Amino acid sequence: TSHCRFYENKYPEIDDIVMVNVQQIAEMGAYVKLLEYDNIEGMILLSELSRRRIRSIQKLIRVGKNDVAVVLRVDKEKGYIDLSKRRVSSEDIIKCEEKYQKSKTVHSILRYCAEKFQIPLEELYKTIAWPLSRKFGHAYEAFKLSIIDETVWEGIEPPSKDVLDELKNYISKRLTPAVKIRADVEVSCFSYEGIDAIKDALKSAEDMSTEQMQVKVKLVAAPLYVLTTQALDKQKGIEQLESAIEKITEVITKYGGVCNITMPPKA
Amino acid sequence: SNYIHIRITTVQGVPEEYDLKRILKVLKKDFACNGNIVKDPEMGEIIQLQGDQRAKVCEFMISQLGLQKKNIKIHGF
Amino acid sequence: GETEEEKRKREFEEGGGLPEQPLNPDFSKLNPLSAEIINRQATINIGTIGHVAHGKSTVVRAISGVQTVRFKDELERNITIKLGYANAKIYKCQEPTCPEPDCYRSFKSDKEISPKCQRPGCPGRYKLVRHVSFVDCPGHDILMSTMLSGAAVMDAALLLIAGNESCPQPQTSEHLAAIEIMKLKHVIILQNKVDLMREESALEHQKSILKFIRGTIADGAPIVPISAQLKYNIDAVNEFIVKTIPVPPRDFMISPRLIVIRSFDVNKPGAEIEDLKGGVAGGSILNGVFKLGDEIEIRPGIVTKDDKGKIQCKPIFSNIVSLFAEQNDLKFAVPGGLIGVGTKVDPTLCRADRLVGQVVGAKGHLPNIYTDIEINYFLLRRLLGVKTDGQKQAKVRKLEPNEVLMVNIGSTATGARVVAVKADMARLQLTSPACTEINEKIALSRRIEKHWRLIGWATIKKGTTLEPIA
Amino acid sequence: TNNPELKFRIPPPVCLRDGKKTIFSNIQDIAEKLHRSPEHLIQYLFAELGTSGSVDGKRLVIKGKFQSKQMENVLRRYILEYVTCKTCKSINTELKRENRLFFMVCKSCGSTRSVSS
RNA sequence: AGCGCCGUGGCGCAGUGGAAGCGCGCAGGGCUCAUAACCCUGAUGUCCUCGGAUCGAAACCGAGCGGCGCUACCA
Ligand SMILES: Nc1nc2c(ncn2[C@@H]2O[C@H](COP(=O)(O)OP(=O)(O)CP(=O)(O)O)[C@@H](O)[C@H]2O)c(=O)[nH]1
Ligand SMILES: [Mg+2]
Ligand SMILES: [Zn+2]
């Protein structure tokens, strides 16, 4: 049962940035539903329609799809939103789309929860999305921190523990990330040994692999050895792979060989 | 490979031993036709030619740069 | 209802399999034709020479069945830089009834010590007369240094001539001259194309070839028609190899050495580095016996430049972990065979083209790296490898001081600067490290027509030593 | 002995034009007349046009307006590139897999090149 | 042999998460005296074969296929 706007109140705010889904255009413009705030219809007049001059109303609208938008006035007595699209900075259009994406992902998760439990989605949002969005600024960061930290649910009152379990499962399977950090070390050794040296550097670099974040350095070439890690927080890998570099340098500088670095640790 | 062809008009497939704007300057005069050097999102080279003159651009690369003259395919269209 | 693999396994076990080399056999009695040496290692190196766009790897593949790679995408089709290898076993029928020409049968490396004869009607088997190694050499006008190195490694020659093109092709003449330079006379001439030809065209081409080889060093060189595509008349080539080419004097008295022509790294990608292998230098042993677990140093080795422009040579000591020969890991090595020494030398030192023509000596010897060498040179009249369009094939001029000329000392490919010019002798200044052990056969090439072109032969007489930095 | 005639075992293609449906019931016969894998023949014949018909049995079915000379030219070019090795006059040569791609190999000699595009 | 990409509507490009995408083509119709230009409407798919979590997967994941591109023949 799809209801319950993402944000705090049913009434959208003034001058806010939104993402509008189009349904119907007769003569005055496009009075369309909203998928960032509540579904109260916002009306767009032809004057605020086109950045260019409107040439064919059929082409530029593309009914049934979302477009970036702004709201000028909100009728807070029964519901009449005045809305526009041309008066938006070109820099914030992508950010509006990102906010639409975040809301749509959160609502897909919570709609799955509601349709599985037959619980009104307003109940779920008032017990799940609103407290989390308050605690962490946004429900998306709340779910991401739920993935790493299970304490984000503490201080919150679920309607049922089954909701907690199924929601956590769907997050852990749908929001599962963790960016690969990859680098390439060159072996320039003209030296006496150098397979036992690489073996020893391999041992002292693979032992460093922690439980949550393992550094497995594969072989693709004799000189070019690859350094691949799954950076959960995207900041441990830089120092881990710097440690790998210092280890390989310490191994090489005493046995007789020489090595340099081709590709430094990059996300 | 190095497949060169003309599609109703445009020439797609162009080795770049000579400059493409120089290609426009050596096409536009003799052919007298409008030509647009458009960079599509990462296909081969695109050069326009208004009016169907496929044999004329055959004559052209014969004159300027054509050295194989066998993989150039005259499309039906 | 036996599977073909099962029948082959039965024939392999019936044929005695392949007995393993003794860990410590008596060497003062071992001969290159001994059973233990012959079963799992080649004793004679046979190289092939020919002109471009003719096919040498095809003939080697037809003779043996061991493929020659032809790698590097671009080189998969046109020309190869590194040499080609292939192991063939000479098997001769023990039965007198069958005709001599088809008695011999050349098999590939992992065949048993006695396979069954494929001729219909002979219940006899084959006996291993000799195991032969094949060193395919490039025959393009650009790649000569590798061909000269492999011909220095080479001990027996197979010249390939095709008929339908021009009778006096220059590339084969150049390769024959190079072979004549480095003390090698056992040359077998082979007709590449006979099928598409008429019965008199072949005779005319044969008359032309005989006319060609009358004043060169080789005189009694046999000529044999062969096919690379139809795969016929290979047993006759095997018989000619057995008859014409004996074993060059190679006993166990002379000191051990190694001449690496190819560098191979063993790093299988995708597998975790926990289980890896040492680096392999592909080298020929022409003098000495090498055993598992030996200490060895690459003599020219680490070439480095100091801040003052001086060239420092660091010999590359290393312990031999394995000596891969033919098909299986072996315990002892036989001189006169291309063997891969898999040592603990760092795999990046054997990556692409680092040990291409480098001398290596076992611990217990002191080779000499030289910076300035004294050379005795002898020239030829007409430059070989050029088709002059009807005017006097180019006459080689005398050398001039301070010219970078390619002086292929055996396998080492270096560009030396001439410091002194006289009637027979010359001082060569080497920017790249080169070493001398006893004599070393050397080829000389100049730059007259872009690419390198052979002029004559050379022998080191003296040199300025560089004392190793320990 | 082997070649009394001194290849030409390539039959004239037979395509049936039923007004709206073009049927080629000669694909398997040329498969046995060229020593090719019929799956690879069909995959190439799909990859050259904008069509992928139906396989039935030994025959390919497509539903449209097409000629018969086009696949004569297709067969002759395919023979020049795969069915006949450029190096030698032989048909029995075929496609094996020694890496991940298709490697072209011969049957008279055993030439090893990478012809799979 | 591995790693970085792809899986078309004739084609190029897209989001892949509630269910066929946009444009280039093609056909048909409108405009005009008429053409071009312009405007409207269509029909072209296992978005590569097989499974998983999931009320649901073209995608999220894989147990592999077919083709790409980097290493470089990877005894
Ligand atoms: N007709 C015919 N073709 C042959 C014969 N031998 C080889 N070929 C052709 O030569 C081709 C292989 O040539 P290849 O051996 O690579 O030439 P190459 O040895 O690299 C030339 P270079 O030694 O100068 O590098 C094959 O495709 C084959 O068709 C022959 O006896 N007859
Ligand atoms: Mg080769
Ligand atoms: Zn063939």
XYZ file of C-alpha atoms in Angstrom, chain D:
117
model
C 48.644 -41.553 -57.123
C 46.950 -39.160 -54.686
C 45.938 -36.433 -57.174
C 45.017 -37.840 -60.600
C 43.053 -34.650 -61.333
C 46.018 -32.242 -61.215
C 39.256 -28.018 -54.468
C 35.887 -28.159 -56.219
C 33.404 -30.005 -53.984
C 31.227 -26.933 -53.397
C 27.629 -27.471 -54.591
C 25.469 -24.736 -56.136
C 23.289 -23.294 -53.358
C 19.570 -24.114 -53.468
C 17.368 -21.507 -51.775
C 13.570 -21.666 -51.980
C 11.548 -18.431 -52.121
C 8.012 -19.115 -50.880
C 6.800 -15.581 -51.437
C 7.358 -14.467 -47.857
C 9.596 -17.261 -46.506
C 13.151 -18.015 -47.642
C 14.338 -21.541 -46.836
C 17.893 -22.833 -47.203
C 17.843 -26.635 -46.863
C 21.484 -26.914 -48.001
C 23.295 -25.879 -44.803
C 24.014 -29.393 -43.538
C 24.879 -30.686 -47.014
C 27.516 -27.963 -47.307
C 28.497 -28.778 -43.714
C 29.414 -32.281 -44.890
C 30.821 -30.860 -48.144
C 33.152 -28.473 -46.277
C 33.907 -30.308 -42.976
C 32.678 -27.588 -40.636
C 30.743 -27.609 -37.399
C 27.137 -26.756 -38.391
C 26.658 -24.737 -35.199
C 29.563 -22.497 -36.216
C 28.213 -22.243 -39.768
C 24.853 -21.094 -38.413
C 26.422 -18.681 -35.910
C 28.489 -17.043 -38.661
C 25.536 -16.866 -41.053
C 23.604 -15.122 -38.287
C 26.528 -12.823 -37.430
C 26.887 -11.568 -41.020
C 23.286 -10.364 -41.490
C 20.709 -8.819 -39.200
C 18.894 -12.151 -38.992
C 18.846 -15.252 -36.799
C 16.386 -17.768 -38.236
C 15.407 -21.250 -37.131
C 17.336 -24.520 -37.366
C 15.294 -27.535 -38.441
C 15.792 -31.096 -39.627
C 19.577 -29.746 -41.719
C 17.984 -26.488 -42.851
C 17.813 -22.796 -41.945
C 14.539 -20.862 -42.077
C 14.090 -17.099 -42.368
C 10.917 -15.147 -43.110
C 11.480 -12.368 -45.610
C 12.493 -11.271 -49.101
C 16.036 -12.284 -50.036
C 17.924 -13.422 -53.129
C 20.064 -16.487 -53.896
C 23.272 -14.933 -55.277
C 24.006 -13.296 -51.914
C 24.773 -16.582 -50.181
C 26.763 -17.805 -53.172
C 29.022 -14.803 -52.585
C 28.891 -15.459 -48.827
C 29.945 -19.080 -49.325
C 32.775 -18.153 -51.691
C 34.146 -15.520 -49.297
C 33.747 -17.900 -46.338
C 35.620 -20.548 -48.328
C 38.389 -18.039 -49.021
C 38.659 -17.152 -45.323
C 37.921 -20.406 -43.425
C 36.917 -23.368 -45.604
C 40.041 -23.030 -47.753
C 43.258 -22.128 -45.974
C 44.892 -19.118 -47.607
C 48.262 -20.905 -47.526
C 47.161 -24.179 -49.172
C 44.388 -25.574 -51.387
C 42.484 -27.793 -48.956
C 38.915 -27.931 -47.637
C 39.203 -30.506 -44.844
C 40.744 -27.822 -42.619
C 38.553 -26.806 -39.694
C 38.228 -24.998 -36.357
C 39.501 -26.406 -33.051
C 40.256 -24.929 -29.614
C 43.826 -25.442 -28.368
C 42.838 -20.372 -26.042
C 39.318 -19.139 -25.255
C 38.929 -18.111 -28.915
C 38.658 -20.415 -31.946
C 41.962 -21.562 -33.470
C 42.051 -22.534 -37.137
C 43.815 -25.838 -37.846
C 44.469 -27.905 -40.962
C 44.071 -31.606 -41.726
C 46.569 -32.174 -44.552
C 49.430 -30.563 -42.589
C 48.263 -29.050 -39.300
C 48.905 -25.331 -39.732
C 48.135 -23.371 -36.549
C 46.839 -19.804 -36.911
C 44.179 -17.782 -35.081
C 41.329 -17.294 -37.573
C 38.121 -16.762 -35.594
C 36.833 -13.267 -36.496
